[PDB]
Design a protein around this ligand. Sequence first.
Ligand SMILES: *C/C=C1/C(Cc2[nH]c(Cc3[nH]c(CC4=NC(=O)C(CC)=C4C)c(C)c3CCC(=O)O)c(CCC(=O)O)c2C)=NC(=O)[C@H]1C
Ligand SMILES: *C/C=C1/C(Cc2[nH]c(Cc3[nH]c(CC4=NC(=O)C(CC)=C4C)c(C)c3CCC(=O)O)c(CCC(=O)O)c2C)=NC(=O)[C@H]1C
Lengths: 482, 482
Amino acid sequence: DLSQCDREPIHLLGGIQSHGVLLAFRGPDRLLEVVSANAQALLGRPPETLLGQPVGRVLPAEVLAQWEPLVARGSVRVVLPAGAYRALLHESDGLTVLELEPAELQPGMEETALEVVRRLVSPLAGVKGTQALLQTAADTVRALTGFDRVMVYRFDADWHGEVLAESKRGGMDGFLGMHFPATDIPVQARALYTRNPLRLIADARARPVPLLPPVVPALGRPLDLSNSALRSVSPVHLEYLRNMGVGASFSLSLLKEGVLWGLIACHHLEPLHISHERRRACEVLTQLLALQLSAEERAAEASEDAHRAALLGQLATAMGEGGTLEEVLEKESERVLALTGAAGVALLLGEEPLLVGCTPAQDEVEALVAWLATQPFQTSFHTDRLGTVYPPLAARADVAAGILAVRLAPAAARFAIWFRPEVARTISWAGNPRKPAEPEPGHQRLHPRGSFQAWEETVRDTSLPWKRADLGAAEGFRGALV
Amino acid sequence: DLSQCDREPIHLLGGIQSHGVLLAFRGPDRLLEVVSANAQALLGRPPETLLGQPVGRVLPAEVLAQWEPLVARGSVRVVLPAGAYRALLHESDGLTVLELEPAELQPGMEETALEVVRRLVSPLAGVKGTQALLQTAADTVRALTGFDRVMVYRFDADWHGEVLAESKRGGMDGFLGMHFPATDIPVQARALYTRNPLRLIADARARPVPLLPPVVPALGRPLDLSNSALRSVSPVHLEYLRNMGVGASFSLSLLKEGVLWGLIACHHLEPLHISHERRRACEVLTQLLALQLSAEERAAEASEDAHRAALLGQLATAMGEGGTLEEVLEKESERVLALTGAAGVALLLGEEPLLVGCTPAQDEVEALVAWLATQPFQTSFHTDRLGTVYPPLAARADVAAGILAVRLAPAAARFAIWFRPEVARTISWAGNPRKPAEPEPGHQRLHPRGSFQAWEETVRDTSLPWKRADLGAAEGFRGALV
Ligand SMILES: *C/C=C1/C(Cc2[nH]c(Cc3[nH]c(CC4=NC(=O)C(CC)=C4C)c(C)c3CCC(=O)O)c(CCC(=O)O)c2C)=NC(=O)[C@H]1C
Ligand SMILES: *C/C=C1/C(Cc2[nH]c(Cc3[nH]c(CC4=NC(=O)C(CC)=C4C)c(C)c3CCC(=O)O)c(CCC(=O)O)c2C)=NC(=O)[C@H]1C
């Protein structure tokens, strides 16, 4: 359901965090437009008094010698008097949208950047599992701008997610597993994160600094601050960090192969401005955690599912050295079930079902086969919820939560079914998940929580996943019968 | 092993590069021992002299201050009065080796490194090929190194290689798709190069500078320069360089899962010296693109299995729809001969066989299974020189030159089979391959072929190799047949 929580724009609010400068430009012969009410304190002359007038009479020679490499490169460092801000410029609704914002004072990005990477590459990064690859990234990021807590929120099936990492300092608090809503990182803001990686909260305590004039004439609405460098997050959100205990939040959204995945949150007690160069060079590492995952699952599967095929190679030679189904299936029944980490498996070979392992009762399975053949799957049908699809076997979960249809022939409702049982799973949650926001009596403008502390729910009457292998190994048996 | 090549003790041969200095520090109260002649270019007062003499008492105030940090971390910025060197160390052979050699002049090296780390990582990497993956790392290490010429070398099965890639400037002779031995980078140096990636040969033409006392006092044989940098090499190496038009060297070891997948050599038309932060920065780039293309191997594997399944999904419905095999194999005759990507199949499912593609005769089919029972193999026999191992039916250059066994029945003479033809594959041999290196009347000392010109080896009659996933679509077919 689209919510007042997800219908809400970003991109086109009010403007930029109180530490940049947006000086706009409309068409040919340069010429300023949408400015930034804070502009008369890093320039030299007030905003309203150069909102009509061209670049010649707005910027100093510095940035106007640099104007050419700017277009031509992306960003470009200029050391004009207040210090040495950035330059990052893109294209908007009809504009050249030049902004600067402070630059990096240490000459050990390059140096600390290159020792920090080596960690999250190495001669062989996967050694002691994937809680390391998650934990070294989360570490580095922390130990590459400095922070007092950072994790790896991962989204799942229903876009709700949890933190599989945690790097911290001498006795804060901090989350870990600890599920928290999907409403949070809403539909708006991972549709937008496919194209725009990271966001900087500079000083979550401090207030947003408007834009000039609040619309960009021609269009009618305000400016697309979407590709922005310093978009200011939103009331729904800082209302919702001033509880938590962040004066920051440093995110760099993952996506190895076009698909989102997680984030790396970075938290910090006191306002903190990491740079564009450092912001982007941890985007380089978020880009090295997404890759080295791609590589190992895309591997695991390869290395894991040989163990699968050595089952099916057992199950097939026995199958042809004394051809006799029931006899040869019994001895290699530990193998059948174990194809798929299963407890039970019926087979309909024409005659009566050969129930085999630790399955439910025959009178039951007969009703289960009619109900199947009167469903659509072109070959297979599985679920981790069971009672949800075919309620009759709800009550007797304990062996019946997840199944593998594998139609042996067309009209023939002969097949085999793999019963997979029931799993505990006491599952932690940051405040009661049943309610992830705060309606003000009319329900039109709302709030977050001030909650964030371990309300457990208990996933149960579900099972395990059915990961490409079960559903693939299993389709080996069905071609191995015909 | 064999000819004088896999003999040359290429770490105990004294000698060291002349820009560098490797001196050695023996015993407890850090106390000199072996110093590398030209050591008074950096200490005014002679090597000969202070082979006695405590550590700090032989080398400067400057460099003493920073004797502390390089124990802990082992790379310092000791900046002295002769363009300030820096010394990486390591403990070779029970004593401590300080390896004074030059700076990075230029403070981008790191900031530039980091940006070519991006070009070869940006999350659409390989979307004009693996080929394009190799030919980036070509132009990126090149930019790091200046070096006029970069290469990339895979060591195909028999240790002897190809140069997939290249990356030259203009009017630069080059081996684009050219092809040569693995005598060269021999037995010795593969074994050494698993242990350290890199090696430099900057001023090839520059003869070595002895390091006294020819042989390490209490051992004999020269110290052991194995895990040094500013060493030299088996002389008659930069030997077969003066036979080229190169006066430098840089070549890394791409290591992929711990086997040596080869190296990238950048050599220069005239001498050049790159740093040890700078060569760290390309050894870094090797253990990165390996991380990438390890995934790309794993990827097009899982994409090609999941392919073959879908192909076999169809196959086994033609199976279950009825008709006996011979009728089912009629059209799927087309589909099975595409299931190991071979020309035809032959059943032999008891009775007189099925020839059912572009097969040899009936009489030669049977001639194999006779012999195929004599020799080993539980389940399989994929060979490609099916005429070397087995001459009689070793003239089929057209119909069969690589066969595939499977036993449809354990201890029984029932094997189904897919033969596939000779394929002419033009090989642009670079120099003579009947001349790795012509010796001196004596056969006691070797210098190496002085002519690297294209040679034709048009190899009549083998198979396109037997790719894992292909190969792997056999244990199944055999299970889902009786
Ligand atoms: C329903 C509307 C609401 C909004 C709007 C809104 N939500 C977000 C996202 C968000 N929420 C979190 C919470 C959080 N604390 C942690 O420790 C972690 C990781 C472990 C998380 C995810 C985060 C981190 C985020 C976005 C990541 C970030 O802070 O950069 C946004 C994103 C701001 C944007 O526009 O980019 C917005 C606009 N917040 C609500 O509570 C509801 C009402
Ligand atoms: C029969 C004796 C022979 C030896 C002994 C030997 N040579 C080397 C050095 C070597 N060779 C290669 C191969 C190679 N890399 C390239 O780029 C090219 C041309 C494109 C070639 C042909 C390499 C990489 C090396 C290491 C240094 C270098 O090549 O730049 C060794 C080990 C090297 C060392 O001394 O440390 C040994 C033991 N080599 C022969 O070719 C024959 C004559």
